[PDB]
A paper describes a structure:
The interior of the core adopts a right-hand organization that is common to all RNA-dependent RNA polymerases (RdRp) and comprises a palm, a finger, and a thumb domains. The active site cavity is located in the core center at the intersection of four tunnels: the RNA template entry, the nucleotide entry, the template exit, and the product exit tunnels.
(ii) The structure of an isolated apo HTNV-L WT symmetric dimer, that is determined at an overall resolution of 3.0 Å resolution, reveals the location of all domains, including the ENDO and the C-terminal region. The solvent-accessible surface of one protomer buried at the dimer’s interface, as estimated by PISA27, is about 4200 Å2, indicating a stable and intricate interaction involving numerous binding regions. The central hubs that promote symmetric dimer A formation are the CTER domains. Of crucial importance is the extreme HTNV-L C-terminal loop containing the residues 2142 to 2151 that swaps into a hydrophobic groove of the opposite CTER, forming specific interactions that notably involve the two last HTNV-L residues F2150 and Y2151. In addition, the lariat residues 2044–2052, together with the mid-link 1905–1907 residues, make hydrophobic interactions with the core residues 1357–1364 and 1513–1514 of the other protomer.
Author numbering:
A (entry chain B): 2104 to 2151
B (entry chain A): 1863 to 1949, 2028 to 2151
C (entry chain B): 800 to 896
D (entry chain A): 1621 to 1669
E (entry chain B): 1 to 216
F (entry chain B): 1187 to 1620
G (entry chain A): 1428 to 1475
H (entry chain A): 1283 to 1331
Write the structure that this text describes.
Amino acid sequence: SLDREAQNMVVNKGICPEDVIPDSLFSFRHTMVLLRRLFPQDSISSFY
Amino acid sequence: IRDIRYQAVDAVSNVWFIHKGVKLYLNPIISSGLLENFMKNLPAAIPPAAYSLIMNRAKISVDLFMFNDLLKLINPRNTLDLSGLETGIVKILEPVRLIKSWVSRGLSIEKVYSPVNIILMSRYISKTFNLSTKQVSLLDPYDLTELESIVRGWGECVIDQFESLDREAQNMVVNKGICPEDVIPDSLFSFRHTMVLLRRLFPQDSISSFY
Amino acid sequence: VLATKSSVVANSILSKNWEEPYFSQTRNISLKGMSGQVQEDGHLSSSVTIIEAIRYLSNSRHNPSLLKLYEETREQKAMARIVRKYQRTEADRGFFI
Amino acid sequence: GQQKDLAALKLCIEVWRWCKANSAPYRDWFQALWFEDKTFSEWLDRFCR
Amino acid sequence: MDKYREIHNKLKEFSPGTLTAVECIDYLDRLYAVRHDIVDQMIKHDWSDNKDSEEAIGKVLLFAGVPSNIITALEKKIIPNHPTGKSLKAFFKMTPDNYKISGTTIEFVEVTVTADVDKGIREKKLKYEAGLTYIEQELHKFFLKGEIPQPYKITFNVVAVRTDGSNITTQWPSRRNDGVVQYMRLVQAEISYVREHLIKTEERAALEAMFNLKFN
Amino acid sequence: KILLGSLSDLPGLGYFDDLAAAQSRCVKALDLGASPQVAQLAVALCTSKVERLYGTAPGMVNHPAAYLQVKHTDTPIPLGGNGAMSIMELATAGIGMSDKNLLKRALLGYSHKRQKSMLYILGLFKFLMKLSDETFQHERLGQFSFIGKVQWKIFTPKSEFEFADMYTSKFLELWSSQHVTYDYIIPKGRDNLLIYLVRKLNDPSIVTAMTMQSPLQLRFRMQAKQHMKVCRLDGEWVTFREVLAAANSFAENYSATSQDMDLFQTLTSCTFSKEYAWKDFLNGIHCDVIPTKQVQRAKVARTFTVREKDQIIQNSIPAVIGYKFAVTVEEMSDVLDTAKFPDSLSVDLKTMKDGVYRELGLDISLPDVMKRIAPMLYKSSKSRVVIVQGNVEGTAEAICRYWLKSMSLVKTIRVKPHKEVLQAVSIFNRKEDI
Amino acid sequence: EVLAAANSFAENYSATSQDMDLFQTLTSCTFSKEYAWKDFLNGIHCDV
Amino acid sequence: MSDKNLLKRALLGYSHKRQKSMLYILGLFKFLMKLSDETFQHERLGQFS
């Protein structure tokens, strides 16, 4: 039910994946930098 | 009536004006805090770019054309489709001459450019967003002004020398990782504002980013 | 007498800062009187140091140093004149410009 | 609060009078111009209320 | 070399936009020093001359058998073609990057790494060749007067390598171009990272001004 | 020479500026060897002359008491003020120290009990500041210190000087706002230096100095004597009575604000330069007559410095301020050229911010905050030479003590607090301690 | 010991802008409407 | 209210002139506050001020 609601919410109108707040103690910047540092990604794919 | 705070006036949408068939764009006047001077026929100082934006507003600036050339150099077929041209009671009878009396040279807010960050961010914008979908001629002038402001001067630093700059950017990005949210093309750049502006101008199906 | 103080003399001469721009110093943009250019009637014009500095900056393409300014205006003939209105400034001492 | 309301009313008066003297889009401007944290049309509605 | 390793170790622990302008400047200076050192080392191993410490021109001539008395006598002379009128003693004090002695022929080479090959070449020429040619005439006159049994031959060669190492093989047809160009590409990427990303956005103008004053 | 030249010349820049010029050159005459009594007589004569010329004195139209509900002594000097200060305070403390003392007293009165006569003075000062923040910001930089002042008309054409009419006034104002670093440092490149010189040429003080001995100056004197439009109230030319009425109207309906209190304290608080506390020194001083015959010694010239520079800041305050305000590459190059220790500029700026945060709740990180607070914190470091009689040591305390002993023309004077009562104090006091 | 510690802390105490603001917060007015009894009593006069 | 009056007088004395006997009272009050900020915060809420 939650997945269907999420699909309904995201398909009809656009959602920017930098404003989604999963909980009151979430920071997009910190979480993403932590995940970048833990799991490296080849930056060539994002720039080439 | 006295103590009128014209300086506190802000504009959100387009503020147009007509005079004897001449179309005027008063948003730069309001943003520069010169609404009182325009209304009451008082002298003021504006840069030539603001004058060009106010008078015409229908011909894109040379900065947007240079950015289009840069995007063509990076990756053609993903460029902006360009079809426009280049470059108590007070009564106003000569608003055009009034604005021309404000034009002068040297009062331009130049910014510190970063030659490699410019090309990196240009290619990030090229790949992330599809710029060959919506005609720029029918775009909102209010948003086109802000895009031109945030892209102003990018072409002047990379078109003349591109191959060396592109090779340096590749060298910098291939060896060690670069996060495309810390690249600062110039001192007057905000990632959040630029990206939200580009999202609103060019919609993207959010299903692809979430499914 | 001067041969026993060669090091300090050299230091003092080099500390005059001959490499700084000529018109960036206060003494060359002051209000002291200065002769202008020859007018049409043939009389030298009484002017001010700041006005002459502005004139040279407008005509020139850069702010030259003392040595560079001397080299540029080496061929220029020296001219002098007596002030129109005497004194006119607390820092104006003399009778010639 | 009264001072801010007075300033907003006076500024709306001035812009309205200027638009009256010339030929200007009254309502379009009133939906465009912004003062403090309330747009001009909302200021008009608050003045009516 | 190990200097590059130390620089990389110091700079992988710095988050983007957290370096003061002066720190960026001195890190860049260290990086240019490392690039110059690695090019000096490639030439070192190419000529197989294990002269780890640079030696002065007077010391090089001493290694060539030149008597000290004539050098001392010439130290009092002045270069007529020197742009700044520097004395021969100071020109003997300075140490070239590398040297080689082969009989009566001595080869002096100055190496610089820059994008503008012609500008660096002409700068090194106006810095070295005037004094080198003056010394050449002095030793030729000494040979004519009979204080040396054999005349000396001096040769100055300046080679500038671009930041990408495209023409390094053309100027230096060495066997070791690949490793050196790979290392110099790495250090160029490091320099670009330091100058363009790690600098605080509030001090980019300060970095630009300091770079212009120091290098331009 | 200075005493007799203090009379004929009219600066014509307004009541406050003419009074300040007369008082400052009377102080200079005192420095050259004038007795404090003769200097006081000259100060009184020049004050009377300027008051009559501007109508400030009680008995004619421009008297502030007829248009303000505040005492004549308590009115700010830019308005109808009483410039009858002692020559001691003028020479030691400064010229605009009366306004500083008045503001300090007003803030002290506002605390403890909340009256209206003192908030009236606060409103008058706020009105003066509002008037001041409508012209070039570099006017407050340098020259005599002031919280705010009324601007007066310039009765001379701008076409007299050849290059004045090259950049428009609005051009100069917007260039000054955009390039604030050039208020503290002199530009090097010609592109900015030419605009700097054109702005300098249009300065009213410099214009008057250039037209000081010309018949054109009688225009301003006749306009002022006839009580015509000579001052500014908003974008219009107004008479001094209108300025007084507007000041009364603004002060009667002025509400105190926490940020306004902080800024008033910023004005009242210590300075970036080590300043001696002359007010409490003079208040707590005592002089005693010793029955000894006067002995005429020789004359020696000593350097009397009142404002020094903190040794912790390796660079000059203008250099650091300009470096902070510089945003363009060429501004940065200019400030690096001017600064003697470019590598320590960041350290000096950090210490400056830390000291400001320690002594004040204001943070200089915001460009507006530092822009507003810099002129009221940094003051010039001009040095003076004072002619003294005997063994006066080359310290400000010694020169002041010599002046105290010189009050009596015949009787020998002894100062009871003969110890060192120097108060060299700056914003930076606990930085080393912390 | 408390008195001695108070003396030791007060003899070497340096005033701070934030401390001044907090002291004024204590001295300033209250969230509840309070009558100024101090100035009322200071300015009062009683006659027999 | 005695403590409040004492603190008000101490702050008034600290202004105008910077003595040490009044900064001594300020330091005493700061020491009292430091002692107070080591127990339950709701103790200051309610009861005597």
